[PDB]
Structures are given as C-alpha cells and as structure tokens.
A paper describes a structure:
[name] represents a class of natural protein nanocages, which is an iron storage protein that widely exists in nature. [name] consists of 24 subunits that self-assemble into a 432-point symmetrical cage-like structure with 12 of the two-fold, 8 of the 3-fold, and 6 of the 4-fold channels. The [name] nanocage structure endows it with unique functions: the primary function of [name] is to store iron while playing an important role in detoxification of iron and oxygen-related radical products in vivo. In this study, for the first time, we demonstrated that the [name] from kuruma prawns ([name]), named MjF, has a pronouncedly larger ability to resist denaturation induced by Cd2+ and Hg2+ as compared to its analogue, human H-chain [name] (HuHF), despite the fact that these two proteins share a high similarity in protein structure.
To obtain direct evidence for the binding of Hg2+ and Cd2+ to MjF, we tried to crystallize MjF upon mixing with heavy metal ions (Hg2+ and Cd2+, respectively) by screening a wide range of solution conditions at 20 °C. Eventually, we were able to crystallize both complexes of MjF plus Hg2+ and MjF plus Cd2+ with good diffraction and solved their structure at a resolution of 2.3 Å (I4 space group) and 3.0 Å (P6322 space group), respectively. The refined structure revealed that a total of 24 Hg2+ are bound to MjF nanocage through a metal coordination bond. The binding sites are located on the N terminal of the A-helix at the 3-fold axis channels of MjF, where Cys13 and Asn123 are involved in coordination with Hg2+ as shown in Figure 7a. Hg2+ binds to the thiolate groups of Cys13 with a distance of 2.4 Å, while it binds to Asn123 with a distance of 2.2 Å. We also found positive electron density map around the ferroxidase site, but it is not clear that the electron density is occupied by Hg2+. The side chain of His63, which is an indispensable member of the ferroxidase site, has double conformation—it may be accessed to bind with heavy metal ions. Thus, it is reasonable to believe that the binding of Hg2+ to MjF nearby its 3-fold channels largely impedes the entrance of ferrous ions, thereby inhibiting their fast oxidation at the ferroxidase center. The binding of Hg2+ to Cys13 and Asn123 did not block the 3-fold channels of MjF directly. However, the presence of Hg2+ could neutralize the inherent negative charges occurring at the 3-fold channels, slowing down the rate of iron ions across the channels to reach the ferroxidase center where they are oxidized by oxygen.
Author numbering:
A (entry chain E), B (entry chain C), C (entry chain D), D (entry chain B): 2 to 18, 20 to 56, 58 to 99, 101 to 172
C-alpha cells in the first residue's frame, strides 16, 4: 500500500471514486448553461448561474481527487454520462431539475459520510462536513428560494424575463 | 429614594417600564424578518426592512431603560409575549400588521405623554416628543406609503416581486 | 414538507426552536447591563461586558433561526420569560449567575448535539460544534478567569472598582 | 417696550434675571476647582472636573442673557454671592455639596418652566427643556454615579487617590 496510507478503508476509497457524480453534476449544469444562451431561449442570467454551478461542481470533483491522493488512495476515473435530457424547457423547469440533482448529490454525500463514520474515519467525516455538506445545504436552500421567487414573478413571460435580470 | 430622583412620579416610572412594549415590537419584527427568509416565501427586501425595524425598536427599549436610570427610576423587566402569529401571509398583510402595531405603540406613547403632562414633568414630555413621537409619526407615514405602493404594484404576483426589490 | 428539507428530523427541528433559550439569555444579560448603570451601582465596565454578552446571545438566536430556514424547518417563536431577578447584587454575584447560565446553555447545546448524532444529522452536529460549542467553552473559561480575578482583587470595595476599569 | 417683545410676560423676564443663580453656581465650582489645587489637597481630577463645571455654569448664564435680549427683556445683573465655604472637605463631601446644588438649580429651572407654562410661553418652555433641563438631569446622574463609585473605591485614602485619577 501507499507509504502515506493510514486508517483509510478501501470502502471509502472506492466511495470517493462521488468524483464521477460531481463531474456528472458539472456536465448537467454545463448543458443548462448553453441551453440558456440559445437564440430561441436567450436567458443570460440563467446561463451565468448555471455556468458558475458547472465550475463549482468541477472544483468539488477536483477537491475529491486531491483528497484521494492525500490519503494514499488511487483515483479511478470513469466515463461521464451525458444528461438524458437536453431540452431543459423553461427556467423554472431547469431550476426544478437542478434542485432534484443537488438533492441526489447530497444524499450520496450523506451516504459516504455514514460509511466514513462506521469505519471510524474522522478525517473523512470532517472533510465531508466542512467541504461538501455545508455547501450543499446552502445551494439547495438558494435554489429553493429561486424557485419560490420565479413562481411569484410569474414562471413564464414578463416575470421570467425580470427574474432572469436580477440573476445576471 | 435614589439620590438623583427629582420631580419623578411613580406613575410615570411604571409607564416607562413601554420598555416591554418596545421589546415586543422588536420581537414581532424579528419574527417577520425571518418569515420572509423562508424558502417558500423568499422576499429578501421585506426581510431586511423588518430586520432593520427589529434592531431599531430594540434600541428604542434601551433608550427607555437608560432614561429610567437617569431619573432614578428602577427597571422592572417583564416577560416578552410571543408575536401574535407564526406566519404573516403576504407582504401586504405584514405591512398592514406593522401599521396596526406602529399605531398601537404610538397610542401608548401619547398616553405616557399625557401622564407626564398631567404631573408636570417637562423632561419626560421632551424625551417623548424628541425621541419617540417624531419617529413614530415618520414610521407610520412610511409604512402607509409602502402599503399604497404595493397595492399599486399588485399586492401579489410580479408586483410583489418588483416592490420587494425597491425595498432590498 | 418544504422543497429543501432532507435528513431533517422533527425532533431536531423542535429542539432548534434553543432559539428561545438564546433569546432568554440575551434578556438576562440586558437586565444585568442596565442594572450596572444604576446610579447606586455605577459599574460601567460590568455594564459594557453584559451589553456585549446580550448582543452575542441575540446573534446566536438569529443564527439558529437562519439555520431553521436553511434546513426547511419552521421557526416557532415563544414568549421570552422575564429574568428571574430585578437586581443582581455585587459584580461577583452577577458573574456567578452568568457562569451558571452559560453552563446551563452549554448542557442544552450538548443535548441537542446528542440528538443530532443519534439521528445521523452531520450537518447539524457541524453547526453545533463550529458555531456554538466552541464559543460556549471559551465564554465559560472567560467568566471563570474573571471570577478568579475579581476574588483576587477583593470582590468588594476598591478591588471591585479597579476590576471594573480593567473590564471597561 | 422693545420693538421685538411679543408674548413675553414680566414675571418670566424677572425669573430669567436664574442668570444670578447660574453665576453663583459657576462661582461655587470655581471655588471647588482651586480648593482641590491646594498643596494640602492635591486632587487634580476633582480640580479639572469642577473647573469645567464652573465654565459650563457661566455659559448657562450667558445663554440666559442672550435669551433675555432675544425676547426684548432687559438684563439686570445682581451681586454674585460668595460661596458659603472656603474649604470643601473631602472629595466625597465636595461631590455631595455639588449634587445638592445641582438639584437646587434644577428645582429653580422647573419652577421657571411652570411659570412659562402658566403664561403660555412655549418659546421659553422650549428653551428650558432643550438648553437646561436636559443638561441638568445628565449632570445630576453623573454626580450620582461619581458618588457611588467614590464610596466603592473608599471615600478616603488610596480609593480617593485612584478615583481622582480616573477623573483626570
Ligand atoms: Fe458538488
Ligand atoms: Fe419603537
Ligand atoms: Fe449563546
Ligand atoms: Fe446651569
Ligand atoms: Hg469506510
Ligand atoms: Hg406621571
Ligand atoms: Hg434529531
Ligand atoms: Hg411667565
């Protein structure tokens, strides 16, 4: 094993290899970002919001890869599936898909925390609490807020046009 | 009595112990402020306005406590009643309740001015005029304007969204 | 349930609504602060120390309210009970009551942490460790030191006068 | 009468000619200020405190002289009586005499306010409330505080020496 490896169970190492999910989350949001720059969609505020979301998921994946190396695990990269859905529809329908996605990632993150806790890895539980679970709750609450605000503004038409601008 | 007490009636001293009313009004606005940060409400402009209102009612109570000590009275702190509701409805409904609350505090402040006048305490009538009654009238006028503007913008829907931005 | 709620058990949500206990603590220390500005007490250093304590305790409560909303729980505000006393005695007696109130809050916060651990909510255990338990131990240690310093300086008379200046 | 006098009653004009009382209080504090600079007293903080008090009482008299002229009345100066004592005792005893004199002046001001109210002179009641009664209550609270602090420090000996310093 690695000269650095210590108290790092093979179950966590393989669970970390979550990297693929973060990269998938990054790619969903990249799809969303450029869907909204379409000449027949033209929602630059949503575009910028999802471009940033895509960058952050990719960084989240890179922190996990860096963590793999710190502990002596070995990174195994797999293919990144494309989103099954290309036409995200309205801004509200994209936000509802992002909420669900943000929410599947956080379940995965909470499952990896339970694995880490069961195998008495406090370095891993600390990482997850400080670098991931905190960000995930903020992101989910934010998107919820955005959904509520867009339904108030009027999920389609003028309210969608005005909500996009406060988002730019 | 206190070595500093002079021309200070025990009825005014009891009426000042108004301190409880200000703290309650501060507690109503704190309730409103965080209600507007719910993920299913998300009115960040209403939230801020009522966060500022809550701080500045609490400062009102502290100026009364300091006054109590200045004149040689003794501060008796009572329980702060829970705010009359959990949920405050629309932003319009919350402005209406704040208007009702502001006029109730004004009426209490005017009654304390009458007691102070009746017992020939010009230092108290000065306090109430310069530090409370002026700002109460200004506050009541502000909230009334805001109610008129929000009814104009359309008390619900896009108008509430756009009026909230104004207020942020 | 809220669109954002996940892994948020109803017992933790009820226990968070700790908010009331924070607000009560804020109200005890506000009572202390203005007691020490009485013309027959005049301890401006103690007064400043407890004004600041009262601000901090109200901020802790607001962070619990902001937290209740992040997780999708609902804030249920409560009456704030009067401080058990009008008058707090010597500066030492006020410090001793504060130490005891700080330990009572710490026990409550430890109990909330237990229930959060038992229901496998690491986002909430992180909140409690990073935002409350650390500060709580530092505050208790601080008041311990002060009690020791004030007994050394001579809890009454000139020593209390000199200790108070060091606190201003 | 003057080209300016309007709603100015003769008994208020004679009550303002308070000028003499302010000048006497100024002279008392001038006596205290230099008493505390005697080589066998040597209390520079008390000395500075009373120097400033004497300056401020003189300004109060001057504002009344200006006020007399503003209203069309005529200033009649009278003999300024000597302070009743050459020597003021301990620091505590000087503060007690000053408290007594602050309350005698305050009472005189309150009687002039009643006179002004009975003759429906709101210009003069505003003068009194804003330029004298407010500063008078603050002065009395301050001196009250100082007396309690000095008794706490230990009205004589080391405590008197330390308290004078915090006053410097
Ligand atoms: Fe992520
Ligand atoms: Fe107020
Ligand atoms: Fe706290
Ligand atoms: Fe004066
Ligand atoms: Hg593991
Ligand atoms: Hg009264
Ligand atoms: Hg729980
Ligand atoms: Hg008069």
């Amino acid at each position: 094993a690695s000269q650095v490896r210590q108290n790092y169970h093979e179950d966590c190492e393989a669970s970390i290899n979550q990297i693929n999910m973060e990269l998938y989350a990054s790619y969903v949001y990249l799809s969303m970002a450029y869907y909204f720059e379409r000449d027949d969609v033209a929602l630059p505020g949503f575009a910028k919001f999802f471009k940033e979301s895509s960058d952050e998921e990719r960084e989240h994946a890179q922190t996990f890869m860096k963590y793999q190396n710190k502990r002596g695990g070995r990174i195994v990269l797999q293919q990144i599936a494309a989103p099954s859905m290309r036409e995200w529809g309205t801004g509200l329908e994209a936000l509802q898909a992002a909420l669900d996605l943000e929410k599947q990632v956080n379940q995965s993150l909470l499952e990896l925390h339970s694995t880490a806790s069961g195998n008495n890895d406090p370095h891993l539980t600390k990482l997850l609490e400080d670098e991931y679970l905190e960000e995930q709750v903020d992101s989910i609450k934010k998107i919820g807020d955005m959904i509520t605000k867009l339904k108030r503004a009027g999920p389609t038409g003028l309210g969608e046009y005005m909500f996009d601008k406060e988002l730019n």
